[PDB]
Amino acid sequence: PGPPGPPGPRGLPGPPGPPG
Amino acid sequence: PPGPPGPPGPRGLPGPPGPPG
Amino acid sequence: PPGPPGPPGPRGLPGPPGPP
Amino acid sequence: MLSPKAATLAERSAGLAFSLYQAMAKDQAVENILLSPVVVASSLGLVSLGGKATTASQAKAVLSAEQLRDEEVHAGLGELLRSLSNSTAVTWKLGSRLYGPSSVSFAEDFVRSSKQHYNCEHSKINFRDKRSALQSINEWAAQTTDGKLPEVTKDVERTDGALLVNAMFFKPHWDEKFHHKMVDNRGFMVTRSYTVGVTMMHRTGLYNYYDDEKEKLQIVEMPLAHKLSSLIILMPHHVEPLERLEKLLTKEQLKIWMGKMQKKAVAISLPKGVVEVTHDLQKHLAGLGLTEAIDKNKADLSRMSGKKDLYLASVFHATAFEWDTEGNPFDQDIYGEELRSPKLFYADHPFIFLVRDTQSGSLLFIGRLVRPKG
């Protein structure tokens, strides 16, 4: 009977790009 | 009785630009 | 009661390459 | 049902609020925005009601209602104001009060007209007594909003002239309520390098929704109680300043976006709490054409006092916008694993929102949330 949970949090920010 | 877990969350932000060469 | 929060999202995409 | 004159002024007010939004959006000092189009148009109606010659003529031009008589503007805006009062507990509180110096007396005819057409009150304060002046203003707005708007401003900028103060409280009542326990702590990203903790409410149901993959933004329609009005939220795909979205926000583009929407299973997550925004529209209204009304040497507000004593110093637009879970109890959504894999409308970064009347399409609210509070 309990409603489904809320969506999970946002994932981690991506890794920095390679050095130019 | 607690309900089922929620859906997956949103994808994280894109990474910052790399350091200068 | 409401369900627990879902799983965290996938980690973001890698960043763009840096400047030269 | 609105009269055809009040309906034309409803679209006039909506267009005026659009230009107000864009003008304030360029202002790097402006953060959150909250504009009620009928209340903004009422400020120009008061200047036209209490003014003559170019001071009253400019106020009608900024409203783009030149082809209408003066008493048609006051009566039309009067019908529009009372139309929103007949749709309360959504909870909607509104107060309008003119503050003049003690050296000036209000003409009885202007007091009768402004109260009849705009529910406008009138008070005299000593602007040089800064503490007593702010208290008189802040305590009136708090009384009007029952404490939801405890203070308007912290400083009166021009100690001579008139201050038009509007205090508002709005609380959207959803057609489909959120579960009162579907709240938790989430991080709101003001920018990519700035995250403030907020309370967020979550509901998953069937909503009108469109994903613009071309211009990278999401649009969802949240109907209000008994589908008499709707709350539309526009949020970019990436965490970015809303300036790019604001260049696309037009009357034409919004309609195109509304037509591409379709009822889909959508998980909506929004910040929960009260957002307090105070605006001084006076200088922005001048940039739209209301130039003489703010000039202390040229203003003609002689209908207000009898002998040309006042000038428009400030037009305070103060609002308390509460996001809450309360709404109408909906019957089962049992014939709808429909919500098993819903689209995510995860509003943890700045978004643009507007409130639209379903019957007339008139704009009840326009604004944005760039920096909440927790």
Numbering used by the authors:
A (entry chain C): 2 to 21
B (entry chain D): 1 to 21
C (entry chain E): 1 to 20
D (entry chain A): 35 to 123, 126 to 372, 374 to 411
Paper text:
In order to function, collagens require the specific chaperone HSP47 for proper folding and secretion. Proper triple-helix formation as well as exit from the ER of procollagen molecules depends critically on HSP47, an ER-resident chaperone belonging to the serpin family. The interaction involves Gly-Xxx-Arg triplets exclusively on triple-helical procollagen.
To explain this observation, we determined cocrystal structures of HSP47 with synthetic model peptides containing the GPRGFP and GPRGLP motifs (from here on called RGF and RGL, respectively). The complexes of HSP47:CMP[RGF/RGL] crystallized in space groups P3221 and I222, respectively, which both are different from those of all previously determined HSP47 crystal structures. The structures were refined at resolutions of 1.94 Å and 2.5 Å with refinement statistics of R/Rfree 20.3/24.8% and 21.3/26.7%. In contrast to all those RGP structures, these new ones employing the RGL and RGF collagen model peptides have only the A-site occupied by HSP47. In both structures, the loop containing His274 moves slightly outward by approximately 1.8 Å (Cα – Cα distance). The results were similar to the prediction mentioned before (RGF/B and RGL/B), the phenylalanine and—less prominently—the leucine side chain clash with either the modeled second HSP47 molecule or the collagen backbone.
